[PDB]
Design a protein around this nucleic acid. Sequence first.
RNA 1: AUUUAGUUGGGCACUCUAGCGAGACUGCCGGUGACAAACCGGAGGAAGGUGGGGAUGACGUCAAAUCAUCAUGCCCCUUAUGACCUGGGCUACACACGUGCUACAAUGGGAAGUACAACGAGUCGCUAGACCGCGAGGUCAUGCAAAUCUCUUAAAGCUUCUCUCAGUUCGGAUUGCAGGCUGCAACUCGCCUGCAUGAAGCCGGAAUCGCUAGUAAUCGCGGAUCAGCACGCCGCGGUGAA
Lengths: 78, 154, 99, 128, 112, 60
Amino acid sequence: SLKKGPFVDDHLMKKVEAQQGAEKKKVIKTWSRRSTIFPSFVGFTIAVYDGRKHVPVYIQEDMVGHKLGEFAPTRTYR
Amino acid sequence: PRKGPVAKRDVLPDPIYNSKLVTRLINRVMVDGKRGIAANIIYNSFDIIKESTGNDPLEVFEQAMKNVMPVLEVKARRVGGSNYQVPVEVRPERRTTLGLRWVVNYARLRGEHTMEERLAKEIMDAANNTGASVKKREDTHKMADANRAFAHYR
Amino acid sequence: QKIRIRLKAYEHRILDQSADKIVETAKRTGADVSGPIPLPTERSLYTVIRATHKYKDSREQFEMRTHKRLIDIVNPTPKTVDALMKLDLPSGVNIEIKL
Amino acid sequence: QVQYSGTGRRKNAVARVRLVPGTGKITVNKKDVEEYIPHADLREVINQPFGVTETKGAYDVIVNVNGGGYAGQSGAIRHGIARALLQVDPDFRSALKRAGLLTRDARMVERKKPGLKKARKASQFSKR
Amino acid sequence: ARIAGVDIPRDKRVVVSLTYIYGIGNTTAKKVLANVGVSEDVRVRDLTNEQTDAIRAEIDKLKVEGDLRREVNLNIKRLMEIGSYRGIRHRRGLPTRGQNTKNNARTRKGPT
Amino acid sequence: AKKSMIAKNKRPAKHSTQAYTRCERCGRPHSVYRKFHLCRICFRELAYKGQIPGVKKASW
RNA sequence: AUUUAGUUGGGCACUCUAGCGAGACUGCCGGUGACAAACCGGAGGAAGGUGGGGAUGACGUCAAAUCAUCAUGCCCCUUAUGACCUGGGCUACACACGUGCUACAAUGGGAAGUACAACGAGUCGCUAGACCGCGAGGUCAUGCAAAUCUCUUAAAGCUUCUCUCAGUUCGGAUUGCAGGCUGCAACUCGCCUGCAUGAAGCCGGAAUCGCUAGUAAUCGCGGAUCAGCACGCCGCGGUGAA
Ligand SMILES: [Zn+2]
């Protein structure tokens, strides 16, 4: 899960390991549905792809116990 | 049913009271064969009779067989579709069926806040002329010869 | 006495006729045969419907019967061991040998 | 020593009775009349053939039965007394048979058919 | 109010004075009464004031909060306002498995 | 589109929880018997053919 | 005899398993009935008038349904409708209806002890004993190709106090926290324990259906597809009405 090892996808981690102490970018197109968050991820803005159309989101410090796909659903509900 | 008649499966008496119809009173409240609760609190209720206005449970069971006893019965036997029946002579099989069904399904209707005081007051009523099951015998006496307006062309 | 074999198959008659054959060959060269032990024949279950697209209730089931035999031999000889290591006929039935 | 052997088969429970001349007891799983059994150990249920043979008796029972509830394997008790009196008294056997006492119930669990819920309980015919 | 923390019924025994309250069920009350080691005797509460105020302080130990609803309100104030999809699904009354709302609306809204 | 899913499962899997099996003469994904590696209805029919070892009809 | 155990002295004694048999077939007798079938009653018998139950559905009746098992003529495409990947979803909720489960209560609960089977499954699959946990469980490590050993000593009863009549020791709905396990991972989209608010329900109106007996009504066990995932299914056993 997270405490018996954080479940963060490795090559997307390698995409975000390249810009650790660098400037906060605007867009990283990804898939973003499997990796959770542990708190060394603060500050970025990574394009969350729902499955049809990607919608980005920026990153604060409070994000500690979930994934990136918890904010762009698969609904289009109206 | 349609072919012909059928047996009736008379019940065996108790090995404690030595009375057959007491077993017939046992086997109408007992749900899922739970003799442990229901039959034992029937024992407790007749011992409540024995402790207050009573001496032996068999004699007061016969006293309940007095004051609940269905003397008559009707059965809706239509001919042309209309409400047609007559006060028929009751079998002592079906007399016991009606009377003990009055007692048991009025113990259902009674519903007092102790699980055997409803049974205790139920058999204090059915053994001593009171309660609405004895008044169900009264109302059975009532419609006896009251549906007789359409029961004399027979 | 340090010789025992098992006989496992579907039916009963081929098992116990072959069991009587090998009991014959065993107590021929020596003596002291044990019992041709019937085992209580473990049974299977299956449950298959009849139709393709609908109609779940139309069941049509199948099962399996597997008789088994155990054979012990008391007071052996080298000749019955030679009979049991160079003769496993019939071949339509399968056995489970020990010593 | 003197002991008896009476077998009994009801509700999928064989019951070997090691009847010994005593006063009328039971050691069921080597336990007494209510060390194993609740209050449903009734008189005419268990002690029926004593009222027709060896009246009132009785003799002490050793038995080991499992299968059925408290009322099931108690039904295997009557077969033990039946086979015991079969061993003992040939002339009381006719009084046993005319009182029944030996007709084994051939009833087991009924075969439960597919297509339904149970052996006979059909589903709710929700027509409309 | 009345004698021990909050939500105290009068002339009821000691498990009732921790059972009715907003914050403590029964097994925590069982362990707290097991720490002291007294009997109810039987349903009425007519005993010494030192024990009642002592177990009042023992309730004052624990989290019987008059603003526990404010604590859950700030929890859901974070929860519905990061984004969040479980912040929406919280007010939907639906867990982290999906609860198949085809007739499952009579909990909250009463769709009749 | 049926012949892709016949040659699909003969690969080694991508990860451990995609090892689903089906029949071999046909391709039913539901109700395959892992002790048979046959589907539902072909067991019944080839059982009526008198070719499956063992299996008899059931009545008790 | 020994025993914590039936260890091994003891053989299959009782039991049990499975092999061949005997067996319930109007088989015998009395009466009714033309002396005809048949019926009513016996004797023996465990089973009496085909013992209970299963397998086995004629001609056909209904353009019933199946090209989504497969074969399959006819019309269509073949740089796409054929094929390969990542995220989704078939699990969403403004409402109606069929089915299953739980209480709606003083026949219900809690503390205590005490019980009783059958069908099976089983060698990368079931866990002996012990340790540590409120707990999901984890840890050392044994057995088990099966009549040995693991699930696997089943539940309602039985005897005490209890909530002693209330949305309540009836009941548990949704929600925060501790977690536990499968998986590459449990927001979408697995299950479970425990701690904490204690929801609704305070016996159901037309119209319904199951069923003529170890059966209705009710309580437990196992198995399938399956790494995980049963109020469903398929069986098995326990109590047992009118
Ligand atoms: Zn197939």
